[PDB]
Design a protein around this ligand. Structure first.
Ligand SMILES: NC(=O)c1ccc[n+]([C@@H]2O[C@H](COP(=O)([O-])OP(=O)(O)OC[C@H]3O[C@@H](n4cnc5c(N)ncnc54)[C@H](O)[C@@H]3O)[C@@H](O)[C@H]2O)c1
Ligand SMILES: NC(=O)c1ccc[n+]([C@@H]2O[C@H](COP(=O)([O-])OP(=O)(O)OC[C@H]3O[C@@H](n4cnc5c(N)ncnc54)[C@H](O)[C@@H]3O)[C@@H](O)[C@H]2O)c1
Ligand SMILES: NC(=O)c1ccc[n+]([C@@H]2O[C@H](COP(=O)([O-])OP(=O)(O)OC[C@H]3O[C@@H](n4cnc5c(N)ncnc54)[C@H](O)[C@@H]3O)[C@@H](O)[C@H]2O)c1
Ligand SMILES: NC(=O)c1ccc[n+]([C@@H]2O[C@H](COP(=O)([O-])OP(=O)(O)OC[C@H]3O[C@@H](n4cnc5c(N)ncnc54)[C@H](O)[C@@H]3O)[C@@H](O)[C@H]2O)c1
Lengths: 261, 261, 261, 261
């Protein structure tokens, strides 16, 4: 769909499953060269790779833990070494577990901050460092959430990490705009990914989540991948520093429908 | 580029010049049926029509002042009568004149509020009324500005009209999300349109505006039309109630570059 | 409580009832000279005046419709003529009626925009015009609502008027900051005023509103008057251009409690 | 000034200098019992203590590094042990150093995140844990910055830490509102503290910072301490989850004065 994406090299962290996987497939379909990333063992990665071959795409899988500085540095270098360059960096890896705020251990807090925020910082730093030293007008896309705006009891660490990601992205966008480097956030609402297959499997929970979505339905991963592909393209040439929410209207205060209150 | 736009009927207010004109041309290129609108000078509208014929597009021009209720109602009806339906409504007409706030007459304030805000409300009302009565999952795009967020001394009426447009759009998006109707705002930064040809003609003013744009250049109308086309397409199916800023980074506080302060 | 308020002249539009009345009483208690405003007949105004005498305060009541330019001009002049000066201008008058957006008449829309937004603009203009011509570091306080942020189906005109008031206030604050004039908004959540005595009288509606308030209770008018008095004082000397929400947590997305979704 | 503060126990991190010191003094003047905190240099803490004795206040100083969990836990316990209770927790400690984002080491990033964000989280956690277990309607005030909103090139770690603090505070405010616990942020603009005595000493830098402040002057610490005292009092009983900016208008985009652009 986007002619300018043909031949671009795209790196996506945590792309062996969920949204990361869908984006990897979408970019392959746009004929871009993709670098898939997995954490423990090359296995879930192979499923994505076969999906990419199925569409005639070209890609490789690189192991790396985004909380380990050398792994992130190596990930970026692997792209340049294998395909000769880097055009788009997508920081997507993330995690979260519920815990009452006053009972949350420092350990749980750090794990989420390190993965969701610091991991994205490291990825952004390495990509931009490369763009600057080689005068490339590349782009960085950071995966955020409606929760960089909507507070989230039981997930104070996750909300904080995304609120922080917002200011990080806006700062990087301003700092490097003069060099043509664009930095944007994507803010997904409730999406139908494997990690949510169980909660949404239960009809009482599913209906509960749907009641918080004005459009009335849980989004599909492809609806997010479409956003990432557009933001990466030249069609979005004058867009930088924003957070594009794709949430079915979730950030518009669902509890106020019907002029209630 | 967007296959789903073929055959869609798009109405654009104030489209005989500037951004409105560029969007009319872009939608014609996507093979959508376009309804151009002119307030007074018909000759200008015909020029746009020739541009559309040049690309093989189909379109008509309808006279109408967005501050006259019957004109707006007639505009929407003209689309349905000529093409049999309506799919996308774009409220783009607008105006502004500088005046110190404490010296602004009620007359100047009303003229801007009526055109920029009320005009958009009337257009949104008529389009949505049609969508609801005929069960159509249409979409409304309202042309805003970085000034629905950035204050604007000397243009207090314009800033107010856009701040109001923001809440109007978010309200409509929430109110009609259950019916599949999407409502979004586009927020252009400094764009190179005829209305700005003189201010930007002067090298000292041009350089002044550019210093407020992190990316360093004044955007082209086509860069905005690209945003409108994407928002109207099914690729943005899960997006509603947002304001998509296309401003080269203007809303990121340009005066804070280089960690100044 | 605030020594600097003694002797200050405070004008409050729509202050014969509700929040306006509570603020008039609070300022009288701070020993400021107050100018009460009523629309139709001096009658409800007398109730407020007696309340002010009861606390040893000094005040007068002036008739005026905020949608009539000459009435607003006269209101400001009446303060200067009676007390010799003007220190604080509070635009509080407002109204709203529910109607489905696609069915709202232009008439209803205009009535709300004229009263809620234009009325506040006229009041701000006259006060600031006076402050500038006489080199007074006065202050303007505009009464907004959580709805300058939270969308409101059935009340699209009200939401728009407040979203507009937000940008108007921020613009005026920036435009006149160099002259020491402060302009701020107060954003009340659900407050217990006479105008809401019936809706809140019904136990099923009351409980419904309370479920949208994290703190669990509908606020009292005095809790808002406390905010206005602080903002007017020198304790808030470095505060300008903001919206101070006093809503029991309403703007924090109440539907997301208990990590729901 | 605030009668309800008499006898309240207030803990302030990093209060041996700057804003923390001014707040400690202001609260002592309101006759509250204060717990000063110093990281290393004890001599500095004693200076603050003398200032408090000078006003007839009661206070103690406790050593503690906010990046050490046991130190924060001990700090809260020291207050309860010495004064028998805790009413207000103020997380104020912080730091920052300029570095180009693509050249920032993981070490510098972590130091700022740990101190500015995690430190505040630990402090908030311990205070709230106490409030909940003893059914106390206490309050937490987190010291933020205009930079939880304004991007900051060269200080990407600081901006991220404050953007994160914003969502942390809003989440905690929503999560604990049912129990009467209030959580708010204060967002200072450019303030005249010792840490800034040199940059502001140089007339060319001072004038540079002042050009970014609409009101035209760098604020004094007392103007911030006034905000903290009000937020802690019962006058702000219906206020929670907000960020109160005290910045002379800095967040209103100073580069847009005079309708420029
Ligand atoms: N799914 C949703 O509804 C939703 C809503 C908002 C935001 N998001 C965000 O989108 C991203 C994708 O979420 P998702 O639904 O696909 O979840 P997911 O768990 O399926 O995907 C996250 C991936 O991150 C990987 N990962 C985790 N920690 C890692 C580490 N240290 N190093 C390397 N890889 C690591 C995981 O193995 C996993 O494949 C996340 O950042 C999430 O916060 C998702
Ligand atoms: N050009 C920019 O840099 C910029 C930046 C932000 C926002 N915008 C917004 O984008 C829109 C397009 O601006 P533009 O640069 O093309 O300006 P423009 O003046 O060239 O286009 C506005 C059009 O509105 C028409 N119009 C005005 N009042 C009308 C009325 N009552 N009835 C019908 N038509 C009417 C005018 O004839 C004109 O063709 C406006 O709404 C403007 O507020 C523009
Ligand atoms: N009460 C709440 O819960 C709440 C919540 C958010 C915002 N507000 C805002 O606070 C303000 C006070 O509301 P309130 O509850 O006291 O309502 P209210 O109706 O009791 O007070 C509004 C006053 O405005 C006066 N008024 C209306 N139109 C006028 C006109 N044209 N000229 C002069 N006076 C006019 C009315 O006579 C009335 O006394 C309003 O601006 C409202 O939008 C109130
Ligand atoms: N001064 C300003 O203009 C300004 C503007 C915005 C925000 N702020 C914020 O206000 C707060 C006060 O700033 P300030 O100007 O007084 O700066 P400051 O450096 O004078 O005060 C910060 C204090 O934190 C202490 N501290 C640092 N790390 C610590 C640790 N690990 N454990 C314990 N104490 C530690 C320092 O010793 C110092 O006394 C900071 O959080 C800052 O981010 C200040």
């Amino acid at each position: 769909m986007y002619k300018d994406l043909e031949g671009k090299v795209v790196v996506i962290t945590g792309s062996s499953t969920g949204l990361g996987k869908s984006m990897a497939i979408r970019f392959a379909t746009e004929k871009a060269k993709v670098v898939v990333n997995y954490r423990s063992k090359e296995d879930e990665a192979n499923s994505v790779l076969e999906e990419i071959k199925k569409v005639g795409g070209e890609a490789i899988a690189v192991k790396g833990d985004v909380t380990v500085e050398s792994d992130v540095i190596n990930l970026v270098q692997s792209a340049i070494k294998e395909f000769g360059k880097l055009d788009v960096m997508i920081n997507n890896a993330g995690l979260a577990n519920p815990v009452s705020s006053h009972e949350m251990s420092l350990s749980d807090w750090n794990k989420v901050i390190d993965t969701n925020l610091t991991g994205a910082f490291l990825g952004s730093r390495e990509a931009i460092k490369y763009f600057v030293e080689n005068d490339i007008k590349g782009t960085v896309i950071n995966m955020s959430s409606v929760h960089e705006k909507i507070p989230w009891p039981l997930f104070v660490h996750y909300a904080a990490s995304k609120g922080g990601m917002k200011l990080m992205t806006e700062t990087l966008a301003l700092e490097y705009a003069p060099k043509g480097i664009r930095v944007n956030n994507i803010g997904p609402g409730a999406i139908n990914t494997p990690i949510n297959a169980e909660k949404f499997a239960d009809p009482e929970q599913r209906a509960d989540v749907e009641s918080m979505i004005p459009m009335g339905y849980i989004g599909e991963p492809e609806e997010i991948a479409a956003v990432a592909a557009w933001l990466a393209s030249s069609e979005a040439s004058y867009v930088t520093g924003i957070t594009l929410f794709a949430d079915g209207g979730m950030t518009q205060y669902p509890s106020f429908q019907a002029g209630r209150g």
